[PDB]
């Protein structure tokens, strides 16, 4: 009887046909509530949301019209989780299943894999890079003339150089491109004899050309040697072109088996980087590549459903750890504030916010 | 499947495929099989919406085939047709007329059935055949006198005066149209005045068309067969007409002659035999049958240029950076690489027809991929039963015991192969390759490089193409800087082994490889990996490191070269290929000598350094 | 009322697949192993029985019992092997001692070799009997083998186990025959059931139904009615008859008063065995009739040409190796006594044979040399004809030898190509005629398929660039590179192909191909290229066929699928798919022996008449019963009879090929050996039809063949050695071409006058909707969503053209004065199909 | 290499391939038998001595 | 359908014929050698017994 209501909801454009077909094929034998939850999860995945919380399944003042109509069929459930666990479709990840019940949320297998990949990458894949502090201090002093006060750009450059993966957060017109230019200029001066390969990427070609022009204008400001000028990247390209996305299929050229031929990577406007593209970009990178992300926390693309940077920069408000505060104080030659409490070391130590416009 | 009285395998069905594609949208294929079905990776993302629509289509069909199966009274069959039209079709301005016609015929059939008060059950096939026959019986004549020229069949009792009346298809046996009586018709046995037969109807239609022509009458028939150039005869009516015309009239200046000669001469004067092809020059001459179609005039004038040779020299410039995969793909098949890479020409159909039945055996790439995966699983000592269950969930393996026998034989062979690979395997890591040869930069990745050397295993028969690929990899490895020995194991105890080489010599040989790639990008290289390989293996002496020039050695080399080129009944041979056929239709000893020279030049180090 | 289907190959393959699914799937692994060893798949099984599925079912020698099953046969074979193994396991020690005691030469039977065999048999015996395969040493340990190697005058080793091995190895153990018989029966039943369900019929099915009806109890009244329908029946071409046809003809007309059955035929010209015609049917019919008549006058050929054949076929007592086919000498017409062929002022013999030098000769070298010699001789004939030295003379009248007179007869399509190339080397145009060919096998079909696939989707670059690179288009690599480099020309070509697709959608298939050929000058460049006329004719035929097919198809993509399906599997028996004549000009004609039957030619050349082929299949006819017998075991006794029938068919083909010549016939003969074991060994010419007549069925050598040829020669028959002719091309004088101009239309026909309606005058979108339904409510079009109706209000009534027509029909027949009747409205709604 | 080209039917070409392949199999068989014979006579000589 | 005719250079065709003659000669030589071996092994055996 639930199938007829699903078809009726499809006729009124309340639910997509793909969602209803998926629900019928997966949870046909299972409880009607399980089928309705699978259909709602497919609809949310079509909208672009990462997960469906079980609280949304519970009847509320604002809810899907179909859920209210199917209330009689589902009746009353004391716990949504216990009923779902019993179904063959939903599991906790121990066995391969189409849907995963993680905590209070429901995920698709592909979305759960991407979330786990991003979390594991930000937590443990990052490895600290120990370099000479005197050379770095001299280069930063050459980059930044004012050393009397704490400079957020100098701290951002120090964090980006001391850590593999890092994010420089800041609003438009706050001097992010100038900071990236100083970072690249310092990185080139750090290792002159060794081969350096810097790559630039952006989600859109418009932002790619904007980044190329701005980085050129910011790099021609400070004098560099010929060998240091050779290391400067020539141009940027679209992120889809960098991974070699085929027009017909979804397969990529630079998959996990074939890593990218780059050492340093910069990704401008990381706010438009959704979860699938981030999870696919993580796999292509090798273990020796340091990556830097550009964007702002308050941008709408960061807080949109499926984004990553919005939840990453959310912990930047806590501040740096106590030990990294002293480390950055010894590096930048100023007093770096320390954040209260300990929530996440590897995540908070790879973030920086530019509050000067 | 069970209704078709066939064993229900539970796979290779529409439901199975839909469940597979939806599981692919839900779950990644790397996870495994859920409820014995492997998810399908391709159906993912926004494009996956299409899958849903497809399911809806099937969701309709399975609904109707169940309902149409049961037999119902005539009264119940009325709402069906209409309900069947709105569910499957979105009607446009032109389609609504045909839909209304179908509904009208269906309603008329069921009304004629209900008029007699037939109460017994009626199957669907009866009404279906009745509908199919009535659709054939009905004809359209709404544009008979619309204003353009009328082209229709001869209808009885319809005689309208026309200035020009033409008749086509008057061959013997085609006209008059014949209809035989049932055989139990009492009227046909005893003819009576006023009876109507189709034969007499057509025999009188011919006279009606004769007398209806006001100004001009035209008659045409097929006198000669186009295939065999054999004589065909016209209808009896046209024959009687031409005989009467010949007997009645005589051509001027034929008064002296007798009646038969004059008749023959007159009948010859009215019959006009046209050409067999439209591009025949005889049509484009001043006369009665001069054509108005200047489309074939150029062909008749025979003024044209012959097709030149397809291959032409092209100026090519090497880019600064060339990937290693590019060089490997080029040296895989240079003759094909010229067409596929330089000209971007792929002689393949855009859509490949789906196999009619489920696979009962595995051949070609379907077997090769499974063998490669099984070998990769056995080299690392992984469980073969899990891979077997995965392939079973995929559905590639045959049903029942046949798939088990295939898997057992393949497991035995791959285990025998991997027993050698396990012994000479050491842990390693892939290193990025960046090299500069003659001003060209090569960037690549070499998987599973170990300090002992380069180890590769492929489940295929021994061939010189694998040796060329291994030699390219070995040159890249040695030029990058490292001490190692290259080893490649193949099917049936085949091994390609290369010792460590110096960096300078590796650069020297890679320079020749890059020059060969550059020459191939300009003009199609005449290098054959297999035929030239046999020629070198026969000519080259491994002990003395020299090319034998003995007449018997040369004769054996030519014999083996032609054997590897043309092949046996079982093996198509290297010569049989679309790309090779595109170059030359037939072999030439000049082409043979050029191929021998280039293949020797490019493949001599392979047999020289092979151990 | 029934329909007709041309092809049943798909039904045969589907029935075979269904039989495989039904039988092989429930088999256990132990039996599935043997089933897979015998056949890889259902298609491999169909490949064996496809010949026997068509036509009348053949009788199987030694048929397996019906009650027997596959598992029972497997258990029986396993029990036999187990008995043999158990006997060997007990006799593994006394054999060694017995062998030493036995007086058998050990030179044949080495102790070390014996030790190897003993160990090999012992290892095989110990292993579980999973499969039927047996070791080679069991053959060495057979009683008969031991009795052969045993020296005479001494004790012969004799054990019960040795006797058992001989009994076992006497007949091969397998399950093929049972599966073959069951598959034949099941596939025939399934195909018949499917065709009965669909209601369709076939050409063979009509004969089968008529035969089954005549044989049934109702057959008597049917035969009486048919006999009353036709009092006299005359059957022409009776040599090519089937058992069912003769059974029918006998049923209706045997021993019937006031009826006549005239069977006219020629047994010496029965060469259609591949179609299913049976000569043994004619042999059975000949014995049943006691009245035989013959025609003793030949009106076609010259007296010398008839005398040569009569002398050639009178050497042996039984020329056609069959007692039921006697040879009667025929006379010559009095009017044809004056005919003669004269070359260079000297009369030539009627029959001339060319002999190739050498003690032994291969097949390929023989064919090449004979093709070259035939080309040289044809060139010499043509040159002598043009100069006028060679003439064909009837009485005093003489005519020059033109190109239309000469003809070459070959047995296969591949040979024909070799003779065509040999003639092309000398610049002599030729035209090939055959009876079994399909236009879909040609490359032109594949190129047309690629062009259609490109036109259907011009937006995709890969398909359009692949179709442009076809040889039919005529574009080199330079043009392809120029088109790839420039985007503007590529976009122009894409727009052109889009226009082609529009023409395809609007006017049809052939109107698009016509414009495509006219725009790119395909026909002109094809006719300019050597050999392009055949390609152009094939293209035009394929275009006509594509038009005929797309006329009866639902969508445009359906036509591409139909073309691809016809290309993948082509039919040669179909008359429509037969390749047309290449050219209508008078050229040298290459015609197959089967097609040449019933035709006459002035000069005939047979370059490869000596070449023969041995058949391996064991399918024959009983000499006494005259019934087709198939031997599944394939015993040599059946292969010998099959070879004899093959040789008789070759003799008939040779007679048919020889009788065609009117004036002169030339044959190429040479000592042919399949595989030379020894130089002193006899040649395989005796197996050939011509060699058997030349050597009287006695194997000899090259010298013996030459001596027999010399002895046969007379005034009519002459022989000359074959040597390569001078490789000089035939020079043909140039011909002037008059100017050719097509007519022009000064006046253009006007489409102003037309009969129109308001809907057609105003509404263009309707199209042909007015033609289908003259009274269709075309005012309302573009139906919308009428899924649900809350209160069934008149506004919620279904909207469209059909509901509007229903509403109009309601008011059409309604009576205005009387009040509305609810039952009438209910009946109208029920008839219309709407809900109650 | 002589300019002259020789034409052979596709069916004709096969038989030579089978024949040459058959000769090689017979040759390989002859080699092993000869080696066994040589091994056997040498072994008997050692036993005799 | 273009695979009906096979074109080989005249020198190449002659070499194939030559290779076949040499294989036949080798076969004949192997035949005689084997016969000689079997004849020798029989005499040796008789001496042992």
Author numbering:
A (entry chain D): 2 to 358
B (entry chain C): 511 to 1121
C (entry chain B): 149 to 984
D (entry chain P), E (entry chain Q): 1 to 49
Reproduce the article's own wording on this structure.
The RecBCD complex of Escherichia coli plays a dual role in bacterial cell biology, acting both as a phage immunity hub and as the primary mechanism to initiate the recombinational repair of double-stranded DNA breaks (DSBs). The switch from the destructive to the recombinogenic mode is triggered during RecBCD translocation along DNA by recognition of a specific octameric ssDNA sequence called Chi (crossover hotspot instigator; 5′-GCTGGTGG-3′). Here, we present biochemical and structural analysis of two phage proteins, gp5.9 and Abc2, which target the DNA break resection complex RecBCD.
We next purified the RecBCD-gp5.9 complex (using the tag-free form of gp5.9) and analysed its structure using single-particle cryoEM. A 3.2 Å resolution cryoEM map was obtained facilitating the building of a model for two chains of gp5.9, both containing residues 1–49. The structure reveals that gp5.9 adopts a parallel coiled-coil architecture in which the N-termini are slightly braced apart by a short anti-parallel beta-sheet. The C-terminal end of the coiled-coil binds to the extended RecB arm domain, while the N-terminus binds closer to the RecBCD core, making contacts with both the RecB and RecC subunits and helping to explain the reduced efficacy of inhibition by purified gp5.9 retaining an N-terminal tag. The overall structures of RecBCD when bound to either DNA or gp5.9 are almost identical, although small rigid body domain movements help accommodate differences in the dimensions of the two ligands. Many ion pair contacts are formed between D/E and K/R residues in gp5.9 and RecBCD, respectively.
